[PDB]
């Protein structure tokens, strides 16, 4: 019964107090669905220029280390939201036609089958939950059931990890005052210091004071980086 | 059976060819759940300074017109994601303690009960689907069922409307070239024209050429507004 399954899982992820409890539960759930491995990968919205990818997996260390050394991240189709439908992606051979080194390496080490579910988080990070299996044998599972179950697992695990302030999911902290945020908003709209001073009935010195403090807080070189980081993560 | 309900609804929203077909189906679904009214509201990510709110409802015109004239949008708690749990919000009296003019106006015109479901879209717009009822009488409905059904309805209606390029959900168009986007990314990271010229092995003239074309395309006063709009909507 899905309604009861769902009821239990929300409560289990609600009550978790550590990252390892989240990872252990995902491992157990993968196992119940008859999967050998999981990986949880998060493409952060920033830096814009080389976005951070953070992960946690039970794949053997040699495989992860190999995936990293071959730069399979650049070709990995399982981490591209454009090829998901309804947040869901059952792996097939066609998926890997532009990622043949990855497909060959994976099949040579014993991987046969897998599935990925994804979600965009409130901070605009993209979370991907993959399950994989070394067995090519048909397991009977309702497509709808698997989809809905992984929908919850990817959301709750990453919501728990967000609540637990985990490095895998957290974007740079921008503890900005109300007034700083207000000035930032006018900045993002293309207003100059002079125009913002008129809008808010303050001096340019005051505007630039606030700009400077926000730059200082996050170690930014200018207001553009502050506004863009704020805009990207939804702080603004 | 939820699995079959879900199967039919995905197909119905997939096959829709107009906005009215989407709205008509939401109206019918509200009615099946025993609701009198629906409203579909979308808080756009931009402009940052007065974010656009676009809506479609079957509420009487006099009510909408009244809600607008009283500026109930400023106090409306049903459109604040901070008070949702799992994207879901069953209306209660406590919800409106800081929105008493709205609650009094609504109850005086005959509203008694309602529910809201929300979703953040790929473009960072926030979509809210509300159902409401003039009857205070207990309807028997499984909380889990109602939650999961509205989860699909809010997603599919707004995904259909995104596919149909509807004004309710679409953010400003930024048809930017690969090279324009690349320069934009370095801009959002805090790089100057000179630094970008060195990074990409081009002249400052070339960099500024591209900046200008992007400014011209969307009618922006400077690169900051272009980068922030791009960053906010996820174009970057
Ligand atoms: Cl989709
Ligand atoms: Cl095979
Ligand atoms: Cl939540
Ligand atoms: Cl009552």
Query: Using CA atoms, how far apart are residues A48 and B195, in angstroms rounded to an integer?
Result: 16
A143 forms beta bridges with none
Contacts of B8 in chain A (CB under 8 A): none
Measuring CA to CA, how many Å separate A94 from each of A99, A107, A108, A143, B161?
Answer: 10, 14, 18, 19, 29
Given a contact cutoff of 8 angstroms between Cβ atoms, the answer to whether A232 and B236 are in contact is yes
DSSP notation for B28-49: HHHHHTT-SEEEEEEE-S-SSS
CB contact under 8 A, B190 and A222: yes
Looking at all shown ligands, the one closest to residue A110's CA atom is: 2
Given a contact cutoff of 8 angstroms between Cβ atoms, the answer to whether A81 and B218 are in contact is no
User: Residues with Cβ < 8 Å from A217, sequence gap 6 or more?
Assistant: A174, A175, A176
Sorted by where each starts, the structural domains of chain A and their CATH numbers stand as 1-172 (3.30.450.80), 173-236 (1.10.10.10)
B178-188 and A223-233 helices cross at what angle (nearest 10)?
A: 110
Query: Using CA atoms, how far apart are residues A56 and A68, in angstroms rounded to an integer?
Result: 14
Nearest residue, CB atoms, B188 vs list A145, A190, A224: A224
User: Which of A219, A201, A166 lies closest to A56, judged by CA?
Assistant: A166
CB contact under 8 A, B142 and A3: yes
User: Which of B47, B9, B30 lies closest to B159, judged by CA?
Assistant: B9
H or E element in which residue A195 lies: helix A193-200
Query: Using CA atoms, how far apart are residues A58 and A139, in angstroms rounded to an integer?
Result: 21
Given a contact cutoff of 8 angstroms between Cβ atoms, the answer to whether B228 and A188 are in contact is yes
Method: X-ray
- Between the CA of A193 and the centroid of ligand 3 the distance, in Å, is 38
What angle is formed at CA A128 by the lines to CA A75 and CA B190, rounded to 5 degrees?
A: 70
Give the 3-state secondary structure of residue A39. Answer: strand
Contacts of A232 in chain B (CB under 8 A): 188, 231-232, 236
**What is the distance in angstroms between the Cα of A14 and the nearest Cα belonging to chain B?**
11
Looking at all shown ligands, the one closest to residue A121's CA atom is: 3
Q: How many CA atoms lie within 13 A of B110 on its CB side?
A: 8
Q: Return the residue of A nearest to B227 by Cα.
A: A228
Alpha helices, H only, B109-233: 143-163, 178-188, 193-200, 204-218, 223-233
Give the 3-state secondary structure of residue A70. Answer: coil
Burial A114-133 (b: 16+ CB within 10 A, else e): bbbbbbbbebbbbbbbbbbb
H or E element in which residue B13 lies: helix B2-15
Which residues are within 5 Å of ligand 4 (an ion), measured at CB? B 136
- Provide the CA A218 distance to its chain's centre, in angstroms: 21
H or E element in which residue B90 lies: strand B88-90
Give the 3-state secondary structure of residue A174. Answer: coil
Query: Using CA atoms, how far apart are residues A143 and A33, in angstroms rounded to an integer?
Result: 12
Query: Using CA atoms, how far apart are residues A89 and A114, in angstroms rounded to an integer?
Result: 9
């Amino acid at each position: 019964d899905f309604f009861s399954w769902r009821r239990t899982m929300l409560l289990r992820f609600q009550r978790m107090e550590t990252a390892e409890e989240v990872y252990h539960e995902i491992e157990l759930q993968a196992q119940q669905l008859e999967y050998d491995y999981y990986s949880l990968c998060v493409r952060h919205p920033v830096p814009f220029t080389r976005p951070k990818v953070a992960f946690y997996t039970n794949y053997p260390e040699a495989w992860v280390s190999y995936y990293q050394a071959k730069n399979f991240l650049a070709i990995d189709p399982v981490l591209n939201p454009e090829n998901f439908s309804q947040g869901h992606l059952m792996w097939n051979d066609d998926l890997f036609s532009e990622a043949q080194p990855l497909w060959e390496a994976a099949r040579a080490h014993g991987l046969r089958r897998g599935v990925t579910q994804y979600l965009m988080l409130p901070n605009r990070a993209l979370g991907f939950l993959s399950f994989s299996r070394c067995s090519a044998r048909e397991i009977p599972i309702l497509s709808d059931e698997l989809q809905l179950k992984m929908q919850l697992l990817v959301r709750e695990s990453l919501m728990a990890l967000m609540r637990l302030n985990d490095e895998i999911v957290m974007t740079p902290e921008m503890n900005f005052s109300k007034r700083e945020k207000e000035i930032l908003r006018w900045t993002a709209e293309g207003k100059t210091s002079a125009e913002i001073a008129m809008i808010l009935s303050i001096s340019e010195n005051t505007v630039n004071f606030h700009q400077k403090n926000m730059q200082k807080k996050i170690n930014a070189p200018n207001k553009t980086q502050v506004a863009c980081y704020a805009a990207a993560t939804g702080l603004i």
